[PDB]
Design a protein around this ligand. Structure first.
Ligand SMILES: c1ccc(-c2[nH]c3ccccc3c2Cn2ccnc2)cc1
Ligand SMILES: c1ccc(-c2[nH]c3ccccc3c2Cn2ccnc2)cc1
Ligand SMILES: [Ca+2]
Ligand SMILES: [Ca+2]
Lengths: 175, 175
């Protein structure tokens, strides 16, 4: 059962979830995606949309990560083209101080020294948005057009035991 | 005709070249490498070893780039394992504000927004060192042991028309 990653012309995400970082023990997510679209947002996350945020998307058909926090600020593309209309397995893992991206079972990117332990300075509420950003696309380090005409399935996001809230699922469209 | 990327126990590079950045028109390099060694430095470059430097190497058999300048500071791993004893084609290209890494004809990494135009503030003399760093390994963002027991061939470095000096080639060892 797959859901569309874009619902109409607007750039708003199709789903938002909120997590308690003080309770999280699983810092990875996994999903399958299929698209003919070379550009868009797969997911966005933040503890503060001004000061601590990240984005996984596609640009020129390839994975792109942008992130901005006090440890690191970067815009990186990596991995194979995903816009070939086949299902691809994606996993994003925060391990130690590093973020790992795996595509179809292969590690394609490791961003080192981009994260740290949870400090009382870090706001302990993390949002995850699917298919869109929680700020205007112009606040990205490198703007793109967020709409991603693709399908998502088999998706697991961080640690369900730490989830505080999730948007209503009746706004979702089956593929 | 290939040359060894490590000459003895010391960590010093096997070759150094110097370029005039005011004259450079080709900002890419290409080479083939073969190694069973999972860790080490392939090349290092700088305009200032304190303030503006970069490194391409291997860690856990995979390409790693570290760079440190006023625009960007990062430590990133990407691409396939290269420590399988086969020759691999590598190309590193500075294009616009981005650095591209290609391995065996495939783009595996694009670091965006890491470079800018040549400004009078930027020291216009760039050094490139092969097989070692031009500072102690402890000054890396993430230390590694620089020695890379591998072989290098078919190597072209930046723009030979901008080259000011190059170390003596009789210190090189054939593979
Ligand atoms: C690009 C850049 C950073 C991240 C990121 N920052 C994090 C901060 C805290 C916990 C997990 C993560 C993840 C990993 N993550 C987030 C949702 N699913 C996995 C993710 C993608
Ligand atoms: C990792 C990070 C940065 C770079 C880099 N910074 C540069 C600054 C000015 C011109 C070319 C380059 C290159 C590209 N380059 C340098 C030698 N051969 C190609 C290279 C590797
Ligand atoms: Ca799109
Ligand atoms: Ca080594």
């Amino acid at each position: 059962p797959a859901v569309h990653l874009s619902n109409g012309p607007g750039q708003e995400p199709i789903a938002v979830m909120t997590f308690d970082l003080t309770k999280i023990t699983k810092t990875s997510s996994s999903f399958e995606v299929r698209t003919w679209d070379p550009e868009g947002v797969i997911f966005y996350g933040d503890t503060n949309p001004k000061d601590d945020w990240f984005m996984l998307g596609l640009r020129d058909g390839r994975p792109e990560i942008q992130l901005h926090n006090h440890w690191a600020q970067l815009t990186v593309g990596a991995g194979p083209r995903l816009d070939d209309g086949r299902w691809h397995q994606v996993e994003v893992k925060m391990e130690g101080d590093s973020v790992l991206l795996e595509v179809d079972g292969e590690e394609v990117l490791r961003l080192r020294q981009v994260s740290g332990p949870l400090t009382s300075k870090r706001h302990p509420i993390m949002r995850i948005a699917l298919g869109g950003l929680l700020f205007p696309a112009s606040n990205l380090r490198l703007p793109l057009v967020p709409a991603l005409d693709g399908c998502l399935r088999r998706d697991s996001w961080l640690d369900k035991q730490a989830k505080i809230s999730a948007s209503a699922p009746t706004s979702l469209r089956s593929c």
